[PDB]
Amino acid sequence: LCCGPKLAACGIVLSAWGVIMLIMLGIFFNVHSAVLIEDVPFTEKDFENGPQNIYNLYEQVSYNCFIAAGLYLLLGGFSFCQVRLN
Amino acid sequence: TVPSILNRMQTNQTPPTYNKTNKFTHGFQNIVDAYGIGTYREINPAPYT
Amino acid sequence: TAHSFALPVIIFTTFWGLIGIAGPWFVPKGPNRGVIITMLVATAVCCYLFWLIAILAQLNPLFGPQLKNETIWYVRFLWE
Numbered sequence: 001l002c003c004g005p006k007l008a009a010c011g012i013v014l015s016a017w018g019v020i021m022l023i024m025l026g027i028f029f030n031v032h033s034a035v036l037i038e039d040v041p042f043t044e045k046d047f048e049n050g051p052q053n054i055y056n057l058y059e060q061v062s063y064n065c066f067i068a069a070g071l072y073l074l075l076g077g078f079s080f081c082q083v084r085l086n
Numbered sequence: 087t088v089p090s091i092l093n094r095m096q097t098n099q100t101p102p103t104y105n106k107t108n109k110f111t112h113g114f115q116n117i118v119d120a121y122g123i124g125t126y127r128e129i130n131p132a133p134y135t
Numbered sequence: 136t137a138h139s140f141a142l143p144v145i146i147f148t149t150f151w152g153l154i155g156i157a158g159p160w161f162v163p164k165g166p167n168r169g170v171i172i173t174m175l176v177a178t179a180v181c182c183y184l185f186w187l188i189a190i191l192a193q194l195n196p197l198f199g200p201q202l203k204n205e206t207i208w209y210v211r212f213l214w215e
């Protein structure tokens with residue numbers, strides 16, 4: 001696979017930014033910080049028993065962030081491969 | 087062998103303006119002068135800007 | 136939660152004051168001396184005033200934040 005060097009450079013920069021930002025988001029989501037609450041796919045029933053459930057959904061979103069950061073890692077490697085290929 | 091000679095003259099005319107620019111400050115000086123080129127050794131806005 | 140309006144003001148006031156007052160005495164001689172000392176002083180002034188205004192905005196708060204019952208329920212566990 002091949003593409004123009006400028007597009008490949010855009011790819012690498014985009015991938016790096018994605019990795020960093022989503023690492024930050026996953027870190028804070030796994031910390032369960034309140035700041036990100038509204039992004040949690042919480043359900044009304046959960047606010048009865050205790051906060052452990054919302055912790056686990058926080059972690060679900062955190063894992064999901066880490067996964068997307070992984071896809072960005074693969075994309076970054078891919079785009080770097082193309083950049084050096086050109 | 088005949089020499090060159092340089093003469094001063096007490097001048098009522100307005101001189102040009104200069105600000106001893108450097109790489110870092112060049113953009114800022116350009117920006118502050120864009121609305122108008124400063125006058126003779128008047129306060130330069132660049133350093134504080 | 137020990138967020139006094141005593142220690143933060145001293146720490147940050149002395150921080151920016153050092154930057155804006157003592158640093159100019161340590162900057163070496165040079166052509167860029169003027170812009171450098173100006174940078175130090177103006178940075179100290181501006182940043183210190185910015186942070187000061189921001190914190191005094193919270194000193195003696197007049198009205199409280201309004202929060203969804205969801206977040207109130209969650210924070211009751213989460214925060215001090």
